[PDB]
């Protein structure tokens, strides 16, 4: 009988500086040996955390962040941004009868040449004085709206860093820009960037990573 | 919102009656020989225009003017006190109009003793569902549907409610009271057709 927990060691996970508070929590690994190092078991190992924790505000609670461990020092695990998503209950709240669902997505390269894919969602809404029930759009409108959205996304990327993009997502400023651009086409509601998934990434360097930490 | 807690519970229950627990709600304003502190607008309304003295019991000042809500029929323009269940009656007691009672902002003055409504100057009227096909009792079609078994006491060849003093209406109002008392102690309906009558139901 081994009872492996005597063999384990705890480490601390540190978020990058883009977020408000950076003590994420702890993980454990079997204590290292000369036969093979623990650090090779730490690298990778994505962790998912609610954005309401990182920012300390409950109105963020329906969004989730992925963090990837890239470097180890001093029993701290130092990590970088890896993806964003919605909780499944929130997504089911938006989808309702008597309205149209619009989706768009685009794939695009950052200035530091990460390659990522981004998803947007929006819904039609009534005017304040409407009397009819169901607020549907015509298919000629949907193409026009979908075109405008794709134009905006492909220029908000080519921001100077993957880090700058993160600083845009938190205050959800992108949602407001789409709101202004479509104002003339059709009334919309619940505009959101739904998901970000990271497809490819440049050859690793420590210099950039340490700038996001101390 | 605002948190209900076991300390606050009794106040919240009173708020759900519609009584002002805060005092001075909507207050706009032989010497002091009597005064009345009360939180119920129905009592306040009578007091003001009889030129009684009202006491703002949250602050200790007399109230000269107040604003609240009452019902107004837009057909005949008569004004009615808001009932304590807090929603309109189905029929105007003056002209007999159906569904014409709207809640209206009102102000009252001790000085004048008069009552003033406040009207939204850009009101847009909605007329959805005012006109629809309805069966006639003496049509040949109706006489066939009536059947051969006389008056069926179950599913009673239902007739729509359209008048205040229609005997069908008398049943529903008293039966509504009965069902209320039964259910509350054991735990211890709509009329017209609505706006969307002209849209088909599968």
């Amino acid at each position: 009988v081994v009872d492996p927990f005597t063999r384990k060691e705890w480490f601390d996970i540190k978020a990058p500086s883009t977020f408000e508070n950076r003590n994420v929590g702890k993980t454990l690994v079997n204590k290292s040996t000369g036969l093979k190092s623990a650090s090779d078991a730490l690298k990778g190992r994505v962790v998912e955390v609610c954005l309401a924790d990182l920012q300390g505000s409950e109105d963020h609670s329906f969004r989730k962040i992925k963090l990837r461990v890239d470097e180890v020092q001093g029993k701290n695990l130092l990590t970088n941004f890896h993806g964003m998503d919605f909780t499944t209950d929130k997504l089911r709240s938006m989808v309702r009868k008597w309205q149209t669902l619009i989706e768009a997505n685009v794939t695009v390269k950052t200035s530091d040449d990460y390659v990522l894919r981004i998803f947007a969602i929006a819904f039609t809404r009534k005017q304040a004085n409407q009397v009819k029930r169901h607020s549907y759009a015509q298919s000629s409108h949907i193409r026009a709206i979908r075109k405008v959205i794709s134009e905006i996304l492909t220029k908000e990327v080519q921001g100077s860093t993957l880090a700058q993009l993160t600083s845009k997502l938190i205050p959800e400023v992108i949602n407001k820009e789409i709101e202004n651009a479509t104002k003339d086409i059709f009334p919309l509601q619940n505009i959101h960037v739904r998901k970000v998934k990271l497809l490819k990434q440049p050859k690793f360097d420590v210099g950039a990573l340490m700038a996001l930490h101390g | 919102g605002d948190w209900i807690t076991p300390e606050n519970l009794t106040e919240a229950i009173i708020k759900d009656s519609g009584e002002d627990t805060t005092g001075s709600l909507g207050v706009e304003a032989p010497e002091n020989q009597v005064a009345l502190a009360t939180g119920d607008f129905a009592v306040q309304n009578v007091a003001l225009q009889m030129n009684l003295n009202l006491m703002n019991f949250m602050s200790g000042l007399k109230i000269k003017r107040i604003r609240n809500y009452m019902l107004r029929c837009h057909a005949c323009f008569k004004i009615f006190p808001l009932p304590k269940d807090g929603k309109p009656k189905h029929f105007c007691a003056s002209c007999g109009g159906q569904g014409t009672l709207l809640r209206c902002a009102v102000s009252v003055d001790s000085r004048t003793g008069n009552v003033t409504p406040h009207l939204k100057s850009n009101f847009q009227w909605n007329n959805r569902g005012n006109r629809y096909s309805v069966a006639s009792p003496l049509s040949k079609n109706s006489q066939k549907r009536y059947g051969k078994k006389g008056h069926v006491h179950s599913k009673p060849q239902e007739n729509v409610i359209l008048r205040e003093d229609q005997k069908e209406y008398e049943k529903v109002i008293k039966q509504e009271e009965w069902t209320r008392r039964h259910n509350e102690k054991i735990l211890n309906v709509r009329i017209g057709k609505g706006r969307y009558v002209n849209s088909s139901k599968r």
Binding site: D89 | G1, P6
Partner: protein, 180 residues
């Protein structure tokens, strides 16, 4: 020192809740000593625990389950059993899990469960001591664990197409076995 659950009400249930609001919070705040508020900003209700005046850890789950049953569409006096009793559960499934059927076949199927004047549904809720709601294609069953299964295996046979007459006979058999 603090723990809470937030739960969301879908729009067709919103109005029934408003009309009942004064009935549901007194049982929670008095009997469970939880604290509650309705957050109309996000069409949700929130239940919160204060450690200084609460009895046991089970209180917070009971409250959420009681509200959860209400948004599924059970009657208020049926939901209230979840505060009082301790072993009730909810089961749910949708007809496309049993058989794929699409048009008028789909409509006829759920009509076959209700029966004329609802009399067939009413029968099932008597031979097994359970409550049933039909929300278009989805079925929810509330009751005790073994009673739930007896209900499920008979609603299933209706959507597979057996005639109602054959099912009434089966209900008689099950009822006598409970007597034993």
């Amino acid at each position: 020192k603090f723990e809470s659950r937030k739960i969301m009400v879908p729009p067709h249930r919103m109005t029934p809740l408003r009309n009942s609001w004064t009935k549901i919070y007194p049982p929670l705040v008095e009997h469970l000593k939880l604290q509650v508020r309705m957050n109309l900003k996000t069409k949700s209700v929130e239940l919160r625990t204060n450690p200084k005046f609460t009895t046991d850890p089970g209180a917070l789950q009971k409250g959420a389950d009681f509200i959860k049953a209400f948004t599924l569409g059970f009657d208020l006096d049926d939901s209230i059993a979840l505060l009082r009793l301790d072993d009730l559960y909810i089961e749910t499934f949708e007809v496309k899990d049993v058989k794929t059927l699409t048009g008028d076949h789909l409509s006829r199927a759920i009509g076959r469960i209700a029966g004329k004047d609802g009399k067939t549904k009413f029968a099932i809720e008597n031979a097994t001591r359970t409550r049933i709601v039909l929300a278009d294609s989805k079925i929810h069953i509330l009751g005790g664990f073994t009673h739930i299964r007896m209900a499920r295996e008979s609603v299933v046979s209706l959507i597979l197409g057996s005639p109602p007459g054959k099912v009434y006979g089966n209900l008689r058999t099950v009822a006598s076995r409970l007597k034993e």
